[PDB]
Amino acid sequence: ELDAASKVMEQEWREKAKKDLEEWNQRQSEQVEKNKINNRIADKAFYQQPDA
Amino acid sequence: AHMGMFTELAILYSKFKPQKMREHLELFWSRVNIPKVLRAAEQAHLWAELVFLYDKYEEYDNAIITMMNHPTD
């Protein structure tokens, strides 16, 4: 019974680890998208009015 | 108060009252035969006591092995 409870706790820890990994990956993707938006804004700031 | 008495006490505690075996170890770890109590804790599925005895005996390799074999206990 103790071994079964330990296996259940291991499965719960694996589920929590998968959830945490997914959340961290989603946050990293959000940060990468925000950095890409900032880079697009910077590229738009490159537009100026010089001579030919 | 030879080491054999505490060794046999720790051996016979695992089979009946494992909840007090940890308390007895935390008091008489220096007076218990190492491999006998290790095998007793292995048969009694007392992984925390195994890790405690490994840490008190500076056996880090077997400690880490037992910890990895039981990530939640």
From Swiss-Prot, chain A:
Subcellular location: Cytoplasmic vesicle membrane; Membrane, Coated pit
Domain of life the protein comes from: Eukaryota
Segments of this protein annotated with the region Involved in binding clathrin heavy chain: 1-40
Family note: Belongs to the clathrin light chain family.
Subunit annotation: Clathrin coats are formed from molecules containing 3 heavy chains and 3 light chains. Interacts (via N-terminus) with HIP1. Interacts with HIP1R.
Function per UniProt: Clathrin is the major protein of the polyhedral coat of coated pits and vesicles.
Full protein name: Clathrin light chain B
Species, as recorded: Bos taurus (Bovine)
Swiss-Prot record, chain B:
Coiled-coil annotated residue ranges, if any: none
Domain text: The C-terminal third of the heavy chains forms the hub of the triskelion. This region contains the trimerization domain and the light-chain binding domain involved in the assembly of the clathrin lattice. The N-terminal seven-bladed beta-propeller is formed by WD40-like repeats, and projects inward from the polyhedral outer clathrin coat. It constitutes a major protein-protein interaction node.
Quaternary structure (record): Clathrin triskelions, composed of 3 heavy chains and 3 light chains, are the basic subunits of the clathrin coat. In the presence of light chains, hub assembly is influenced by both the pH and the concentration of calcium. Interacts with HIP1. Interacts with DENND1A, DENND1B and DENND1C. Interacts with OCRL. Interacts with ERBB2. Interacts with FKBP6. Interacts with CKAP5 and TACC3 forming the TACC3/ch-TOG/clathrin complex located at spindle inter-microtubules bridges; the complex implicates clathrin triskelions; TACC3 and CLTC are proposed to form a composite microtubule interaction surface.
Taxonomy, superkingdom: Eukaryota
Species in which this protein is naturally found: Bos taurus (Bovine)
Residues of the full protein shown: 1312 to 1384 of 1675
Protein name, entry field: Clathrin heavy chain 1
Protein family according to the UniProt entry: Belongs to the clathrin heavy chain family.
Subcellular location per the Swiss-Prot or TrEMBL entry: Cytoplasmic vesicle membrane; Membrane, Coated pit; Melanosome; Cytoplasm, Cytoskeleton, Spindle
Gene it is expressed from: CLTC
Job description of the protein: Clathrin is the major protein of the polyhedral coat of coated pits and vesicles. Two different adapter protein complexes link the clathrin lattice either to the plasma membrane or to the trans-Golgi network. Acts as a component of the TACC3/ch-TOG/clathrin complex proposed to contribute to stabilization of kinetochore fibers of the mitotic spindle by acting as inter-microtubule bridge. The TACC3/ch-TOG/clathrin complex is required for the maintenance of kinetochore fiber tension. Plays a role in early autophagosome formation.
